[PDB]
């Protein structure tokens, strides 16, 4: 597949374990972030002091999650989980496993 | 040209009004941000009522961007202290006609 970069938010929909998430392609970040309101409450988290040059105390998934796209490509990511965030943010941890290129005409 | 997305920082080097800047390709940002520490002090910046979700300074003038293939256009970046890297937002990336592609 192919997606132009425009002033529109560049978005991707995929599954993490059984659940569907939509988020913004975020090439500026090496890690993925899930909005806490979208986090399934039974999924375990670990508090961290990881400095995200966002917040410096994010929660993180305890477990690796299996990501899957609509073409059934898959792999593992371990996202941070942050409140007060308007959109999920797909970072280069995930984008690198989907073999995404940036291309110019 | 082509640039894979990897764990490495995806970077672009270009000119803004004939000074060279290097920055991170930032698809999650609507607007471009230049480090105040990199900002030529003679280039005027102005206060804004704009919030970034911060009340930041902005280039008073449109800048002409140019890439190494001599493509060009205009941007008016925000200018913010205490950032690690310049950030190329979709304002600039949309004008360079950039695709994201999967094999």
């Amino acid at each position: 597949w192919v997606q132009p970069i425009t002033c529109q938010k560049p978005s991707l929909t995929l599954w993490l374990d059984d659940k569907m998430f939509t988020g913004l392609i975020n090439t500026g970040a090496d890690v993925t972030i899930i909005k806490l309101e979208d986090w399934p409450p039974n999924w375990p988290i670990t508090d961290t002091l990881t400095n995200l040059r966002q917040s410096n105390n994010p929660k993180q998934s305890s477990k690796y999650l299996t990501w899957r796209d609509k073409e059934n490509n898959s792999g593992l990511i371990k996202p941070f989980v942050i409140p007060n965030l308007p959109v999920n943010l797909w970072g280069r941890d995930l984008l690198s496993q989907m073999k995404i290129m940036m291309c110019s005409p | 040209w082509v640039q894979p997305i990897t764990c490495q920082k995806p970077s672009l080097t270009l000119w803004l009004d004939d000074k060279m800047f290097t920055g991170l390709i930032n698809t999650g940002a609507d607007v471009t941000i230049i480090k105040l520490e990199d900002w030529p002090p003679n280039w005027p910046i102005t206060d804004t009522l704009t919030n970034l979700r911060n009340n930041p300074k902005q280039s008073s003038k449109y800048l002409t961007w140019r890439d190494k293939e001599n493509n060009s256009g205009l941007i008016k970046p925000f200018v913010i202290p205490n950032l690690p890297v310049n950030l190329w937002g979709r304002d600039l990336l949309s004008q360079m006609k950039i695709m994201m592609c999967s094999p």
């Binding site: 500026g28 995200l52 040059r53 | 999650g28 940002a29 609507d30 937002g89």
Partner: peptide, 7 residues
């Protein structure tokens, strides 16, 4: 606007 970077 919205600005989503961090090491």
């Amino acid at each position: 606007p919205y600005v989503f970077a961090m090491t």
